[PDB]
Structures are given as C-alpha cells and as structure tokens.
Amino acid sequence: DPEVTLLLQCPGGGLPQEQIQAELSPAHDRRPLPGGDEAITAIWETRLKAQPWLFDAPKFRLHSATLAPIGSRGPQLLLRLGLTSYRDFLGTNWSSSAAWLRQQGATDWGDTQAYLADPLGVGAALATADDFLVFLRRSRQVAEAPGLVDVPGGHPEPQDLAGQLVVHELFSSVLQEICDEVNLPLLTLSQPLLLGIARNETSAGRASAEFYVQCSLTSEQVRKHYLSGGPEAHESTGIFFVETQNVRRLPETEMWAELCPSAKGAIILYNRVQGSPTGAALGSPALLPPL
Ligand SMILES: CCNC(=O)Oc1ccc(-c2csnn2)cc1
Numbered sequence: 001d002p003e004v005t006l007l008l009q010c011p012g013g014g015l016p017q018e019q020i021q022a023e024l025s026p027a028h029d030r031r032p033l034p035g036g037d038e039a040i041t042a043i044w045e046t047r048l049k050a051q052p053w054l055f056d057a058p059k060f061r062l063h064s065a066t067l068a069p070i071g072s073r074g075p076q077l078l079l080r081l082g083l084t085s086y087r088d089f090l091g092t093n094w095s096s097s098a099a100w101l102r103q104q105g106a107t108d109w110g111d112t113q114a115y116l117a118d119p120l121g122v123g124a125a126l127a128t129a130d131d132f133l134v135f136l137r138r139s140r141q142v143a144e145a146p147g148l149v150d151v152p153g154g155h156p157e158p159q160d161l162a163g164q165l166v167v168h169e170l171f172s173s174v175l176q177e178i179c180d181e182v183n184l185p186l187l188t189l190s191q192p193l194l195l196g197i198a199r200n201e202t203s204a205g206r207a208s209a210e211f212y213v214q215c216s217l218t219s220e221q222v223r224k225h226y227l228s229g230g231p232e233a234h235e236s237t238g239i240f241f242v243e244t245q246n247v248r249r250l251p252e253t254e255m256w257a258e259l260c261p262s263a264k265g266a267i268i269l270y271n272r273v274q275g276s277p278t279g280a281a282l283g284s285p286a287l288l289p290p291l
Pocket residue numbers: 136137138139142150151152153154155176177178180181182235236237
C-alpha cells in the first residue's frame with residue numbers, strides 16, 4: 001500500500017483525550033516558498049475567477065507527534081501543531097508541482113513537508129452495537145477520490161494552556177463529523193480513542209488522526225438515521241457495513257482497491273490497535289483463526 005504510511009501507532013488500545021498534550025506554535029507553520037508565497041496567491045486568484053463562491057478556511061497543521069516511553073505515567077503523546085488554510089493547501093499539497101516542493105524541502109530544511117500546508121484531517125473507525133464498522137460511498141462529482149469508499153471524517157477549523165483546548169476541539173470534531181454526515185444523535189456515541197496518525201502519499205503526505213468510536217445503535221438503526229435525512233442531509237451517496245470479523249482480512253478483498261487512502265489508514269490502525277489480541281484468551285485458535 002504505497003499510498004498510505006503510518007506516522008504513529010498508539011499504545012494501550014488507543015489514547016483518550018486526557019493523555020494527549022498539544023503545543024500550538026508559529027514554529028510549527030509551513031516555511032515560505034523559495035520564490036515567495038506569490039505562487040499560492042496566483043493559484044487562488046485563478047480558482048476564484050472560475051468558482052467565485054469558494055471561501056478560504058483556517059486549518060490545523062501537523063508538524064510532528066512524539067510518543068512517551070511505553071508503560072510510563074503522565075501524558076503519553078505530544079502533538080506539535082501550527083496553522084494553515086484551505087488556500088495554502090490548494091497552492092502546495094494539491095499543486096501539480098507538489099513533488100518538486102517535497103524535494104526542495106529535503107534539500108533546504110532536511111524535511112520533505114517544510115513547504116507543504118499539510119492540514120490535519122480526522123477520521124473514525126465507527127463500530128455498531130451489533131459489531132459492524134460503518135463505510136460511506138463518495139460522490140462521483142467531487143475533485144478528491146471521486147466515487148471511492150470512505151469512513152466518517154473531515155478537516156477541523158480552529159475555534160498545554162491553549163494546548164488542552166486544541167486537543168478538546170480535535171476529539172469534539174470527530175463526533176461532530178459523525179453527527180453531521182451519518183445523522184446519529186450525539187448521545188449514541190462513546191468518547192473517542194486516538195488509534196494513530198496516517199499519511200496520504202497521493203496528497204503529498206498530508207496526515208489524518210484516526211479514532212475509534214462505539215455507537216449504541218445496531219447497523220439497521222444507523223442505516224435508518226442516515227437515510228431519514230434525505231439526499232440533502234449528506235455529501236456521500238450511500239452507507240454500508242462490514243462485520244468486524246471480516247475487517248481483519250479487508251486488504252485481501254476487492255473492496256481494498258475502492259478505499260480512499262485516509263480510509264485505508266483508519267482500517268490499518270483499527271486492525272493493529274483495537275484488533276490483534278495480546279492475551280491467551282482472545283489469542284486461542286477458536287477465537288483467532290490462523291491465516
Ligand atoms: C468533512 C465532512 N465529513 C464528514 O462528516 O464525513 C464525510 C464523509 C464523506 C464525505 C464526502 C464528500 S464527497 N463524498 N463524500 C463527506 C463527509
């Protein structure tokens with residue numbers, strides 16, 4: 001799977017909100033482009049003169065993420081974050097010259113991402129009460145991964161002492177994205193666990209935080225909530241469910257070719273962090289079939 005790389009795998013089956021610190025600093029921002037940020041302003045002006053209804057929005061930038069030594073007390077993860085925008089994304093990660101920018105970042109800063117916006121995404125492995133994960137079919141009319149399979153997520157917009165408010169907004173945003181697209185009531189959802197961070201090598205390495213969320217509704221009940229909103233209540237064009245039993249071997253199915261890179265990231269981390277039992281009981285042959 002060349003189109004996805006794991007930056008972080010969480011310990012303990014996934015980290016809760018109270019175990020994560022963030023450092024939000026202008027030291028964590030994109031570097032100005034070698035020939036100046038004029039190239040970004042040029043791409044933006046051209047795009048608005050074709051689609052004048054488009055609007056910019058602020059985004060969190062991921063610089064790096066450092067895990068504590070395993071088994072330790074106190075905070076287990078530090079996220080170093082900066083600020084970016086949708087406009088900066090269109091002029092760097094989405095640019096035809098994105099690979100040139102990665103090479104120049106390696107040469108100038110020893111950092112392939114130094115000239116890239118790299119907005120932080122969130123995504124969820126969302127499990128039902130009857131032990132299915134939830135999947136969504138992408139519109140064939142949109143610019144990114146048209147017609148591919150996705151999981152619930154998005155790119156959260158800003159608004160350890162500003163740090164803790166930023167971690168709160170990250171965890172909050174994955175619940176809000178599930179309520180907005182799946183049309184589930186907020187009270188049917190568990191507090192998220194962070195499984196890890198995955199990079200999309202088809203979007204010049206922009207990263208998504210991948211979370212596990214449990215729903216108290218069955219697959220049949222989730223389907224009813226999604227459809228009951230009508231075609232205008234969701235950007236996706238269908239919902240479907242795979243038994244958690246069958247997620248273990250998903251990379252060996254014909255479904256794997258239809259998954260967008262950020263959804264591959266969520267399923268890889270779900271398999272490594274929530275699946276893959278460590279103990280004698282869940283490890284026994286009858287409960288963990290070989291091959
Ligand atoms: C940022 C919103 N995200 C969220 O709530 O989950 C989704 C999942 C998929 C799509 C989508 C876009 S085009 N075809 N599908 C939209 C939303």
